[PDB]
Amino acid sequence: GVHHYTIDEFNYYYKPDRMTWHVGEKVELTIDNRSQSAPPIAHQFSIGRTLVSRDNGFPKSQAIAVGWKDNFFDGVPITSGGQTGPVPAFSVSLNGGQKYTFSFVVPNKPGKWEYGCFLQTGQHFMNGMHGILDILPAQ
Template identity: 35%
Template sequence: MSKVPNEPPIESPEPQQPEWSRRQFLVGTAAIGVAGAVTLFGRQSLVNAARSVFGSPVSSGTVHLYAYDYYYIPNYMTWRVGDRMEVIFQNQSHTHWHEWTMGRHVNEAYFQAFGNLPADAWQEDFWDGVPVTLSDPYGIDNFVPNQAIVTYVGPKAAYNIQSGGDFSPTLKPGGSLHLSFTVPNKPGLWDFGCFVQQYIHYRTGMRGQVMILPA
């Protein structure tokens, strides 16, 4: 190099090149921005819209319901009144108890409270008056039948039946339970969730929905 170090390099004039398009740039980046915003904020709306337009497949027969640390898979199901169902509920957590309760109208305001929490749950329990058969219990912490009409397969001791609160099988880490029932005539949208640890699981998003279609 034959220049003083702080000297600029020998400048060669710029060749005439076609400019990239300003309009392409603006439209392209704006489109990418919109697509980004939709993927960040609009996924649930897209899913809901798709569900309301196309519906979602009805599950019947044997269905797996997995509980993880603080979510369910699946968290949305569609059932049809009169279908015979067997839900295999399985707790996949390594560390935490999880339960499966289902109902309507939970008083969320209670859940925001600090200090002494009221023991509240669903105002309407889905399982009220529903005949259900439980089988293959493994790692059950406790089971509250509430108003359901329950048939137990095998020795009852394995279910650790207790009272108080909603219909709720509570599983230890790795536990599982089969619930067989005919979908009762209670059409509409039902919520399910896990109220373990003072509702914290529910409050942190361990919840789902079941859409029950009329027969």
């Protein structure tokens, strides 16, 4: 069947912050921006590998996240309401209280992926806004 997954966004973390899918699973994923602040803030949800950070040539106690080198959803056909097809550079951006639901088949990309928010020049990411996606081979 279609498996329903929900990832809630809060300042500055995801619930759940860990998720496990199998290759070939039918997934319907809802990203919901449940920002609790006054005012509430926008959040990003991107699945990728290999973190890119800023560089200025000086060392940092905390590297400033700017994105993923590898997008998990590259080539992955997605359905969301009336639209079907792959989305170039797919990332989910939501104002406070907006949600977005989309469905796909988990691609043959096994192993450890990460999800993250790069907004406010990586301050959300530095504050904890990232999680881990494990892709298991089809049983």
